[PDB]
Design a binder for this molecule. Sequence first.
Ligand SMILES: CC(C)(COP(=O)(O)OP(=O)(O)OC[C@H]1O[C@@H](n2cnc3c(N)ncnc32)[C@H](O)[C@@H]1OP(=O)(O)O)[C@@H](O)C(=O)NCCC(=O)NCCS
Ligand SMILES: CC(C)(COP(=O)(O)OP(=O)(O)OC[C@H]1O[C@@H](n2cnc3c(N)ncnc32)[C@H](O)[C@@H]1OP(=O)(O)O)[C@@H](O)C(=O)NCCC(=O)NCCS
Ligand SMILES: NCCC[C@H](N)C(=O)O
Ligand SMILES: NCCC[C@H](N)C(=O)O
Lengths: 182, 188
Amino acid sequence: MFSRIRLATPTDVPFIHKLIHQMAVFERLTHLFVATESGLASTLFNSRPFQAVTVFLLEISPSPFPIEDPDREKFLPDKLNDVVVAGFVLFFPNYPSFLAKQGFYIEDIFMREPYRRKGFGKLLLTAVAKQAVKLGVGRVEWIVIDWNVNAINFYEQMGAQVFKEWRLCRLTGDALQAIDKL
Amino acid sequence: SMFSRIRLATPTDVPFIHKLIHQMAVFERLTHLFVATESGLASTLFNSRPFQAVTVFLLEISPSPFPTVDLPIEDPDREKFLPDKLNDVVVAGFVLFFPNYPSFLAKQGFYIEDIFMREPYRRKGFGKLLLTAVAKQAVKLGVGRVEWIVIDWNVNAINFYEQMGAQVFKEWRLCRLTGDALQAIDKL
Ligand SMILES: CC(C)(COP(=O)(O)OP(=O)(O)OC[C@H]1O[C@@H](n2cnc3c(N)ncnc32)[C@H](O)[C@@H]1OP(=O)(O)O)[C@@H](O)C(=O)NCCC(=O)NCCS
Ligand SMILES: CC(C)(COP(=O)(O)OP(=O)(O)OC[C@H]1O[C@@H](n2cnc3c(N)ncnc32)[C@H](O)[C@@H]1OP(=O)(O)O)[C@@H](O)C(=O)NCCC(=O)NCCS
Ligand SMILES: NCCC[C@H](N)C(=O)O
Ligand SMILES: NCCC[C@H](N)C(=O)O
């Protein structure tokens, strides 16, 4: 079984939408998932890779590039080819101010359930890491939910530090409107 | 009285930004992690347009109305924070932020890396002003969410954030690959 990581293009938007949806299902947060394909197509491709939101897709094939998967049909970039989008990583430049240099923040990293535990998640993170080194990025950060001990273990095995002392803060759209009237 | 202004940072503001980030590191007891130089800031802060990448707002204070409360302020570092040595204007604080991407919204938001008022200018409403400025900018640009992180012992900031209507979560954990971790993965 062969694998490839490639950059997302505008025609990949349906797959990206569905992957983010599956992330929301995994996190039990579907009520927060308001993304549309329209919104993704509007926001994902306004800059060059690495300068803003960037997406890598992991594709799988039983043949070289030129497991029960129930959703296979939803994830074929081309119906005539046995190539299936198995997972993705979505990230963008951040700014660790103590380093006075850009880093990367990983918003999502996700393998569809049938392709878990096969080394593909490692491949995705490796690809972000190697790109970070090449581009002189000094740090990669993301967040994980506390019950998600599977991801935490994965991250820790890949050499990530997972802290207990930092708390996420958020202003929602509604909170922002409220402040805006000041 | 004392008058206040928020403005975008320019390359000549790098010394002040450096010193403010340094004071942030002191506050957080993380000076061992503070390796930023003025050189690095000058080479990384101004490669893009405002709001489209790392962006800094400075809060300046002047005893005179600004060429766009009575309580006197003892500021020992005033001389380190004058954009013009002949001018009665002092950099009192900053917010440093950049576009993020809440994927569930499929639209850019903002993440705040630092928000900081120098100790002599705390508890006077200026922190509110900084956050308000980021928030208003977010609304104008159609941003759906603003996020940042706070350290668990920092009950002052937590309270401030909560009073500004922020949600402060218990369930999310910060994860990090250091430079060293990245080199190790690179050799796979
Ligand atoms: C987290 C995730 C991206 C990891 O991808 P993955 O493909 O399952 O992980 P890998 O198979 O690359 O695991 C890395 C290696 O460590 C091993 N390993 C040991 N314990 C592991 C664990 N708890 N999780 C994953 N791998 C583990 C794997 O077997 C693998 O070795 P291998 O190459 O010989 O198979 C994915 O599995 C997943 O769970 N996605 C759900 C979304 C999620 O949890 N997101 C976090 C947001 S809160
Ligand atoms: C957190 C911080 C940015 C807030 O700045 P600040 O200017 O002190 O905050 P404000 O003056 O706007 O408000 C602080 C609170 O003190 C009280 N206060 C402030 N000014 C007041 C006044 N004039 N009268 C009465 N109470 C007042 C209020 O409870 C106020 O909350 P409010 O603004 O909703 O009324 C500032 O304390 C700081 O720089 N600390 C460093 C810590 C940090 O930022 N860490 C983040 C990473 S862990
Ligand atoms: N609130 C974010 C600042 C934390 C510090 N820059 C760090 O690198 O841990
Ligand atoms: N790990 C990042 C995913 C978190 C999710 N999009 C949220 O908004 O809660």
